[PDB]
Every structure is written in C-alpha cells, then in structure tokens.
C-alpha cells in the first residue's frame, strides 16, 4: 500500500526527548513557543488534510442532466467573466464538471475545485482541504525554518568540545533540516504563487492560456481571504437522506 | 403518483463561481408555475446562499477562532454554511408544502446534487 512521511515526525521528536531541557537559566527563557506550538499546528493541519473529504462529487447516477446528446463532442462552453472555459462531459462521474474542477484518474473520482493528487497526502486536494493543506505546508516550512535558524542554540552557544552524550541527538536533525528545507520551501513558495494568482497547478501545466485568461483571478487579497478565512464548505457526499411528503395529485 | 419529467436549472455563471442559479425561467414550466413566483423563490434562495458565502467580519472572526482552537470548534459547533443549509432546507420544505404541491411540483435540496443543478 502507501505510507506517509514518518521520518518527518522522527526528526521533530529528537527535539522533544532531549534537546533543550534546563538550558534556559542564562539565555532565552521561553522555550516551548519556538517549536511545540508549531509542531502541534503542523500535526493538526496535516491530519485534517489527510483524513477529510476534499470535495468528492456524489457520483452522479445515470439519467443525469440531459440525454439529448446524440453525437456531441462532449463539451459545452460557458463564458464566465466574459471569458469562455471548456468543460467536459465526464463519462463515469456522469455530469458536466463545472468550471475549475476535474477528474483525478488514479483517485478514480471526479471532484470539485481540483489542485493536485499525491500519495504523500494520500488523496487529491480539492477546496475543502485546500485551506488545511495550505496551512499545513506553511506551518511545516515555518517549523523547518525555525529549527534551522534558531533551534541550533544547543550547538551555537556550545563550545568546541560538544562532546557526545546529547549532542549527537542534534547532530542528525541539522542535516535532516538542511536536506528537507529546500524542497519544502520551494513547494510552499510555489503554492504561495498559486494563491497570489487565481490560477493553480493543472492551470500551470496548461501551456495554452495566453491573453485574456484566468477569468476567476479576483483580487489577490480576496483570494487569500477566501482560502484562509472563508466559512468551510460542507461535504457533498454521505448527507442523510430525506423522505417524500405526499403523492402530490 | 405519476411522474411526467424533470427540469434542471443550471447555475448562474456571469457573476462567477458563486452559488447562485440561473434565475431565467425555463420554458417547460409554463402554466405549471408562473414566472413571478419562480423568480421570487429563486431570488430568495440565491440570496440565502450568498448570505452563506459573505466575507464579513464574522467570517474572519470564526476563521481566527478555528485557527486558534485547532479547529475543534467545528466538532462542538456547526459551521455557518451548515446552519444556512438548514435554514434553506426549511425554506424549500415550506415552499414545497405551500405552492408546489398543489401545482404538482416538488423541489429537492441542491446539496444532495452537490450544488450543481436544482431538480424539480
Ligand atoms: Zn469525473
Ligand atoms: Zn484524488
């Protein structure tokens, strides 16, 4: 099957067991704020991004939409903001795929507003979990930056000898941070660009949009507002089923 | 309980991706439902969903509170959109029991359809 990134937690716990207990008698007193809160935020955001419905559409059954399709090329055009977008008559999901969403192929589902699929996240990112994943990445890169830039006190104040005992605990986490920071920083900066622009991932892959493009570009601050402080969407699948009222004549 | 057919209302897209339906009255519903009351109900339902979306100060505050409390406030308290869905569900039930039922029509919650098309 597929597995998560266990090693990333393993690097963090080096700081949790023995890295800086009882050093704050003459130096920086306030210990936990540097790493503990960041680790809790990272864990919470990562978990809520991993186990959560990202926007699975409820597998539109047959006899859906209009059946007058005789030999249509399976795409109807809608002009949002005056700019046309080409959507698709999805075969198995059996609906028109409203603009800015697609299939997931390997995930075997067709979803709402789509960003990317990955085995590390174990799913595909819609918009329900896009805020959670975005804060997870921001908090994780913040955690790595905080480690590599300030948690090195346990060596930086430590004189030449640094002889064993507990120093070897910090020995490996330094190179772990060094090797892991560049990819995560680049990827989170990528997603920062994708948030600044109203334009994400597969839209980067499409090397065709040249001109009056990105109809839903909005206004930058508005995009960060809707991705951070908007009211979370509810799940489109698994809602309790209601009951009929009457024969209705 | 015989059934004649189903009519779908596409979502209004000139405004954008926000959850408002195409208010334009379909031609199939002639003499079953008048244009005026259909306009009225679609406008009110769209207003309700727009109210569910508004980026007001309360949305910012609830986002900040959720971020601070590690989102456990969702488990204790339902989100704003969920209570708006409850209110609009009550709205559609009362509308169905007061206008559509004598006219031989019934409306389903679009949330069952994934907020794509409303089925009558
Ligand atoms: Zn699909
Ligand atoms: Zn997926």
Numbering used by the authors:
A (entry chain A): 17 to 265
B (entry chain B): 6 to 125
Paper excerpt:
To test this hypothesis, we used cryo-EM to experimentally determine the structure of the Zdhhc5-GOLGA7 complex, obtaining a 3D reconstruction at an estimated resolution of 3.9 Å. We built an atomic model of the complex using this map, guided by a high-confidence AlphaFold 3 (AF3) prediction of the Zdhhc5-GOLGA7 complex as a reference model. In our cryo-EM model, Zdhhc5 comprises four TM helices, a large cytosolic loop between TM2 and TM3, and a cytosolic domain following TM4 that precedes the long C-terminal tail, which is largely unstructured and thus unresolved beyond Arg265. The TM2-TM3 loop features one α-helix and four anti-parallel β-strands that together form two zinc finger motifs stabilizing the DHHC active site. GOLGA7 contributes two short amphipathic helices (α2′ and α3′) that insert into the membrane along Zdhhc5. In our Zdhhc5-GOLGA7 model, the Zdhhc5 RNYR and GOLGA7 RDYS motifs were positioned within two distinct interfaces. In our structural model, Zdhhc5 Arg147, located on TM3, interacted with the α2′ and α3′ helices of GOLGA7. Side chains were consistent with a cation-π interaction between Zdhhc5 Arg147 and the aromatic ring of Tyr76 in GOLGA7. In our structural model, the GOLGA7 RDYS motif was located on a short loop following the β1′ strand and interfaces with the Zdhhc5 zinc finger motifs that stabilized the DHHC active site. In our cryo-EM structure, the GOLGA7 RDYS motif makes direct contact with the zinc finger motifs that stabilize the DHHC active site of Zdhhc5, suggesting a structural mechanism by which GOLGA7 may enhance catalytic function.
The small molecule caspase independent lethal 56 (CIL56) induces a unique form of nonapoptotic cancer cell death that is promoted by a complex formed between zDHHC palmitoyltransferase 5 (ZDHHC5) and an accessory protein, golgin A7 (GOLGA7, also known as GCP16). ZDHHC5 is one of 23 mammalian enzymes that catalyze the S-acylation (“palmitoylation”) of hundreds of proteins in the cell, regulating protein localization, stability, and function. The family of 23 mammalian ZDHHC enzymes is defined by an Asp-His-His-Cys (DHHC) active site motif.
